[PDB]
Design a protein around this ligand. Structure first.
Ligand SMILES: Nc1ncnc2c1ncn2[C@@H]1O[C@H](COP(=O)(O)OP(=O)(O)O)[C@@H](O)[C@H]1O
Ligand SMILES: [Mg+2]
Ligand SMILES: [Mg+2]
Length: 983
C-alpha cells in the first residue's frame, strides 16, 4: 500500500488514465493483480477482482457488465465464462442426463454464479450520491455559499430548493426505470433436479448450474434456465423472447448448439404449456446457460448497457459554451470596470463580479429537461405505445424511412381458406373450394395431419395457418396418427414435414408443407408440370396466400425432404387491416419512405404494396430477379418515380457480387420479398450505411434481428413492454408508427423551446443586473427569489405538458441549436428586452416626483429605491412574455392554450404581477411603495409593447429565406435523377 492519493484528493475524474496510474502502481503480471482497467480505444473502465472463496485453488474472477471473466492458470488469460463449454458435443448432454452430484454442484456454482439476473436495489444514500456528485451541482453548491456570504438568505434558499427538485426528478427517472427491469426478471421458483442416484430434493431456481439436469412439470410454467431438451416434447410460448404468442414445438435433441438447435432449446423465461413425456416416467432437460449468459439475460444486459444512438446529443456543447463564455465575460469585465468607476473598495468587486457568472447558470435547467422527457413517455403510454429508453423518443422525429412486414402487420393475421388445387399426373385438375369433399387419398391426409397444433384445454391451439386447413376438412384431433413431427416450421427454411401412419398401410408416408417455389424445386421433376409458374401466378398475383403440399412413402434425419411427389396448392386469402391504407398514404404524403419487407411470395407482396399504397397507380416498378448464377440482373418490368421489387436470393446475389450496384437499389427499392430472418437484419444495416434513419414495424420472431438493428423498432400487439424492442406497441395496427413520429417531433421541438427559454431567461436577468450594478443599486432578495423560484420554475415545468399535433407534415425539426434562425431570434428578442428596460428607466428619470438613489450607502443595505421598482416590475413581465413567445407549436406541437396548467399559471402570474404595479406587497420584495400617480398605467403600456412586439417579431423571423447533400442517399438520388439506373 502507501500509494493512495487521498491526501491530494481532499484539496480539490477528468482524465481517468492520469488518476488511476498514480493511485495504483502500474504493475504487470495479472496473475498477481488486484484491479484491471478495461480499454486500444474507447472509454476506460476500472474493474475490481472479486472476493474468491475457492479453498482448493485460488479463483480469480470479476464481474464486468454482468459477464464473468475467469482466470485460467494453464493459459494465463481472462476467458469469458460463457465461452467455457462452447464446442460441446451433442452426445455429451446425453451422458449428462443423470445431472451433477453435490460434490460437483458446489464447484460449478462458484465458476458460474447463482443464476440470477442481478438488478441491484440501490439505496437512497447510494443514489443521492450518484446524482449530486456532479460538477453542475458542485457549481450550485458554490452558489449557495457565495450568496450566503452577502446575506441573501432568501436567494440562497431557492438555489437549494430548485436543486432539490432537480435531484428528486433524476431519482424518479432512475428508480422507476430499474423497477421496470426488476419486475420482468423475477423468477423465484421451486425446481426439481436429479442427482447421481435417485433424488429430487426440490432445489431453488437460483441454485442451478450448467450441466445439471432438470425435470419439467406437466402443468408447465416459466423456464428458470436456458435448458436443452433431451427426452420429451413440450409446447412453449416464446412471447417474452420473440414476440409470437403462438406456441412453438420443441423436439428432443438427437445424438451426434444453441442457435443451430433452436428447436431443441428451452430458453429462459418463456412459458411451457403441456410438456408431454411419451418415452419414460418424466421429461428431462439439461441446463446449458445461466443468468447473464442466456438470452433474456443478454437482452437485459443490452438494455442497461446500451449503444450510442446515431444522433448528436443536441449537436453542439463546446460551441455553445464558448459563445456563452465570450458573451458572459464581456458582461463580467464590464462590472469590473464600472464598479471601480463607482469606487467600490475592491473587496466587494470580487463578490459582485462572481455573482454575474452565477445568474447565467440557471438552477432549473436539469429539472426542465427531465420533465420534457417524462411528459413524452407519459403521452405515449396513454396512447398504448410503451418504451424502455426514452432517449430514443427524439429519434422518432428523425425517421426518414420505415420498413414493414406484410403478414399480420399490414394485413390481418387471421386467414381463410379458398380451396385446394389438386394434381393428377401433371394436370392441375380444377379447384375444390370445400376440401371436406375430395376423397380419402394422399392429399386429404396431408392437410389434416401436416400441422403442429395441440389439444389444449377444450380448444385447439396453434399456428393460424394450421388452425384453418384442419378446420377446412374438419377431422377430430385425439384415424391416421402422427408418428413424429420430423421438422417443425422454421422461418428460414420455409417448410414443415410430418411422418404419418394409419392401420391398413404397407408403409408410412412422409408429408410436407412449404412455400410453392421451394417445394416444387425439391420434388421429383417428373411430377411438377410445365405450367407451375403460370398456375401459381394466377392465384398469387390476385393477392392470395399460397402454400404447397407433397408426399413420399417411407419403406430420423431430413431424408424426408427430397424426391417428393407434388400433391396440390392450398390457396388462402389475406386481407389488409382497415387502418393500413390511411397510414401508408399519410407517410407517403410527408416524404417519409415506406418499404415492404416480408418473407412471403413476390407477386403476393407486390399486390399488397398496391392495395395499401407503397406503389400508387401510374407509378412504374421493376422486378429485378438476379439469377442464382453470377450473371446479370435481367430486369423484368411490371405492367399493371421508379420503384424496385426484389426477391430474397436476388438481394443475396447483389450484396455478394454487385457491390457498387447495391446503393442504387436501396434508394429506390420498395418491395423486398422472400427475405430470410437474417436477411431482414442485413437490409436494415445496409440502409443505415446510406445514412438513413430507419424505422421498423414488425411482428413475430422473424423480425427480431431487424427490430434490434433499427434506430426505431416497434413491436405490435403485446402487454407491458417486452425486452425485444425499444418501443413495444400494443395496438395490432401500424397506426402506432405515425404516433411515434408525431410524438418524436414535438419532443424534439419542446426541447429546443426549453433551450431557447433558459437562454433567453438567463440573459434577461443578466442584463437586468448590469443595469443595476451601474448606479450601485443591485436587485433585491425576495425579488430574486420570486424571479427564480415562483415565476420561472412554474413556467418551465408546466411548459412541456402540451402535446403533439394531429397531422404530420413534410417539415422536420431542425436538429441544431446554433443556427441562423435561432441566433437571429435570440439577438432580436434581446435587443427588444434591453429597449424596454433602458427605455423604461430613462423615462422615470425625467419625472418631476423622482428623487435619485442614495449611492453612498451600499448595494443591498438601505435601498428600496425607484430605480429598482421600475426595473423589477418591467423585468418580471419579460419572463412571462418569453415563456409564451418561444412556446409556439403550429408546425409541430399545438397552440399553447390547450395546455391548461400553462394558461392558469401564465394568467395568475400575469395578474399578481399587475397587483404589484397598480394595486402592494412592498414590505417584502423591498419595492418603492411611494408611487401614486398615473405613471403606473404608462409602464403597463410599455409591457404591452413587448407582449405585442415579441409575438410580432418571431412571426417575421419565421419568414426567413436565406439566399446562399451531406447524406449519402441524397447524393445517389440526385445521380438517379440525371441518369435512371434501371435502363
Ligand atoms: N405454418 C407453416 N407451415 C408451412 N409453411 C409456412 C407456414 N407459415 C408460413 N409458411 C410459408 O413459409 C414462407 C416464409 O414464412 P414466413 O417468413 O413466416 O412468412 P410470413 O412473412 O407470411 O410470416 C411463406 O411463404 C409461407 O408460405
Ligand atoms: Mg408467418
Ligand atoms: Mg408476422
Amino acid at each position: 500500500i502507501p500509494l493512495l492519493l487521498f491526501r491530494w484528493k481532499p484539496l480539490w475524474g477528468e482524465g481517468s488514465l492520469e488518476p488511476s496510474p498514480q493511485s495504483q502502481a502500474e504493475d504487470g503480471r495479472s496473475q498477481a493483480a488486484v484491479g484491471a482497467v478495461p480499454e486500444k480505444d474507447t472509454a476506460l473502465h476500472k474493474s475490481e477482482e472479486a472476493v474468491s472463496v475457492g479453498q482448493k485453488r485460488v479463483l480469480r474472477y470479476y464481474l464486468f457488465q454482468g459477464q464473468r471473466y475467469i482466470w485460467i492458470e494453464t493459459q494465463q488469460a481472462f476467458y469469458q465464462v460463457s465461452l467455457l463449454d462452447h464446442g460441446r458435443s451433442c452426445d455429451d448432454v446425453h451422458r449428462s442426463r443423470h445431472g451433477l452430484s453435490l460434490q460437483d454442484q458446489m464447484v460449478r456454482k462458484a465458476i458460474y454464479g447463482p443464476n440470477v439476473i442481478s438488478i441491484p436495489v440501490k439505496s437512497y444514500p447510494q443514489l443521492l450520491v450518484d446524482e449530486a456528485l456532479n460538477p453542475y451541482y458542485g457549481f450550485q453548491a458554490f452558489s449557495i455559499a457565495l450568496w450566503l456570504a452577502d446575506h441573501y438568505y432568501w436567494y440562497a434558499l431557492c438555489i437549494f430548493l430548485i436543486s432539490s427538485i432537480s435531484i428528486c426528478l433524476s431519482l424518479y427517472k432512475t428508480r422507476k426505470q430499474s423497477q421496470t427491469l426488476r419486475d420482468m426478471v423475477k423468477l423465484s421458483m421451486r425446481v426439481c433436479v436429479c442427482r447421481p442416484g435417485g433424488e429430487e430434493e426440490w432445489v431453488d431456481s437460483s441454485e442451478l448450474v450448467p450441466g445439471d439436469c432438470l425435470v419439467l412439470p406437466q402443468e408447465g410454467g416459466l423456464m428458470p434456465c436456458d435448458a436443452a431438451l433431451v427426452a420429451g416434447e413440450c409446447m412453449v410460448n416464446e412471447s417474452s423472447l420473440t414476440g409470437e404468442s403462438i406456441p412453438v414445438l420443441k423436439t428432443a435433441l438427437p445424438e451426434g448448439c444453441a442457435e443451430t438447435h433452436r428447436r431443441h432449446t428451452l430458453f429462459c423465461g418463456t412459458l411451457i404449456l403441456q410438456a408431454r413425456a411419451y418415452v419414460g416416467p418424466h421429461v428431462l432437460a439439461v441446463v446449458t446457460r445461466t443468468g447473464f449468459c442466456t438470452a433474456k439475460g443478454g437482452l437485459v444486459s443490452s438494455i442497461l448497457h446500451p449503444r450510442p444512438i446515431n444522433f448528436k446529443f443536441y449537436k453542439h456543447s463546446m460551441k455553445f459554451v464558448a459563445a456563452l463564455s465570450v458573451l458572459a465575460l464581456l458582461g463580467t469585465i464590464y462590472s469590473i470596470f464600472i464598479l471601480y468607476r463607482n469606487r467600490v473598495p475592491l473587496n466587494e468587486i470580487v463578490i459582485r463580479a462572481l455573482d454575474l457568472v452565477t445568474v447565467v447558470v440557471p438552477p432549473a435547467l436539469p429539472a426542465a429537461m427531465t420533465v420534457c422527457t417524462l411528459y413524452a413517455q407519459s403521452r405515449l403510454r396513454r396512447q398504448g405505445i410503451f418504451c424502455i429508453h426514452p432517449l430514443r423518443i427524439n429519434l422518432g422525429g428523425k425517421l426518414q424511412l420505415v420498413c414493414f412486414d406484410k403478414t399480420g402487420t399490414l394485413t390481418e393475421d387471421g386467414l381463410d381458406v379458398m380451396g385446394v388445387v389438386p394434381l393428377k399426373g401433371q394436370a392441375f385438375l380444377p379447384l375444390v373450394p370445400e376440401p371436406r369433399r375430395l376423397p380419402v387419398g394422399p392429399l386429404l391426409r396431408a392437410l389434416a395431419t401436416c400441422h403442429a397444433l395441440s389439444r389444449l384445454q377444450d380448444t385447439p391451439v396453434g399456428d393460424p395457418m394450421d388452425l384453418k386447413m384442419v378446420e377446412s376438412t374438419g377431422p377430430q384431433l385425439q384415424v391416421p396418427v402422427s408418428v413424429l413431427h420430423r421438422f417443425p416450421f422454421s422461418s428460414a427454411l420455409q417448410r414443415m414435414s410430418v411422418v404419418v401412419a394409419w392401420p391398413g398401410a404397407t408403409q408410412p408416408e412422409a408429408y410436407v408443407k412449404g412455400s410453392p417455389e421451394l417445394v416444387a424445386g425439391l420434388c421429383n421433376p417428373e411430377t411438377v408440370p410445365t405450367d407451375f409458374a403460370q398456375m401459381l401466378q394466377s392465384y398469387t398475383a390476385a393477392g392470395y396466400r399460397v402454400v404447397a403440399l407433397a408426399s413420399k412413402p417411407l419403406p430420423t434425419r431430413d431424408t424426408v425432404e427430397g424426391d417428393l411427389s407434388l400433391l396440390g396448392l392450398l390457396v388462402m386469402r389475406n386481407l389488409l387491416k382497415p387502418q393500413t391504407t390511411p397510414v401508408i398514404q399519410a407517410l407517403r404524403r410527408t416524404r417519409i419512405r415506406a418499404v415492404m419487407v416480408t418473407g412471403d411470395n413476390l407477386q403476393t407482396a407486390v399486390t399488397v404494396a398496391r392495395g395499401c399504397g407503397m406503389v400508387a397507380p401510374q407509378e412504374h416498378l421493376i422486378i429485378v430477379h438476379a439469377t442464382g448464377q453470377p450473371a446479370s440482373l435481367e430486369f423484368l418490368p411490371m405492367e399493371s418515380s421508379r420503384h424496385l421489387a426484389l426477391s430474397g436470393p436476388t438481394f443475396g446475389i447483389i450484396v455478394k457480387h454487385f457491390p457498387k450496384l447495391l446503393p442504387k437499389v436501396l434508394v429506390q427499392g420498395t418491395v423486398f420479398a422472400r427475405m430470410a430472418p437474417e436477411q431482414k437484419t442485413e437490409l436494415v444495416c445496409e440502409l443505415q450505411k446510406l445514412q438513413y434513419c430507419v424505422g421498423m414495424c414488425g411482428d413475430g420472431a422473424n423480425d427480431c434481428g431487424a427490430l434490434k438493428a433499427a434506430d426505431v423498432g416497434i413491436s405490435l400487439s403485446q402487454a407491458e413492454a417486452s425486452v425485444v424492442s425499444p418501443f413495444t406497441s400494443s395496438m395490432a395496427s401500424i397506426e402506432c408508427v405515425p404516433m411515434v413520429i408525431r410524438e418524436g417531433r414535438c419532443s424534439l421541438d419542446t426541447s429546443f423551446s426549453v433551450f431557447k427559454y433558459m437562454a433567453l431567461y438567463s440573459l434577461t436577468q443578466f442584463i437586468s443586473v448590469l443595469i443595476l450594478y451601474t448606479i450601485n443599486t443591485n436587485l433585491g432578495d425576495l425579488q430574486f427569489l420570486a424571479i427564480d423560484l415562483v415565476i420561472t420554475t412554474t413556467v418551465a415545468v408546466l411548459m412541456s405538458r402540451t402535446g403533439p399535433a394531429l397531422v404530420l407534415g413534410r417539415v422536420r425539426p431542425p436538429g441544431a441549436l446554433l443556427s441562423v434562425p435561432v441566433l437571429s431570434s435570440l439577438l432580436l428578442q434581446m435587443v427588444l428586452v434591453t429597449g424596454v428596460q433602458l427605455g423604461g428607466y430613462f423615462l422615470t428619470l425625467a419625472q418631476p416626483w423622482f428623487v435619485p438613489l442614495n449611492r453612498t450607502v451600499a448595494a443591498p443595505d438601505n435601498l428600496p429605491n425607484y430605480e429598482n421598482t421600475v426595473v423589477f416590475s418591467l423585468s418580471s413581465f419579460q419572463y412571462l412574455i418569453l415563456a409564451a413567445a418561444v412556446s409556439k407549436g403550429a408546425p409541430f406541437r399545438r397552440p399553447l392554450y390547450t395546455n391548461v396548467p400553462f394558461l392558469v399559471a401564465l394568467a395568475l402570474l400575469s395578474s399578481v404581477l399587475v397587483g404589484l404595479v397598480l394595486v402592494l406587497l412592498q414590505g417584502p420584495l423591498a419595492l418603492r411603495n411611494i408611487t401614486d400617480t398615473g405613471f403606473k398605467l404608462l409602464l403597463l403600456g410599455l409591457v404591452t409593447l413587448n407582449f405585442v412586439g415579441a409575438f410580432m417579431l418571431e412571426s417575421v423571423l419565421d419568414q426567413c429565406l436565406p439566399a446562399c447533400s451531406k447524406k449519402r442517399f441524397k447524393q445517389l438520388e440526385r445521380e438517379l435523377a440525371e441518369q435512371p439506373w434501371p435502363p
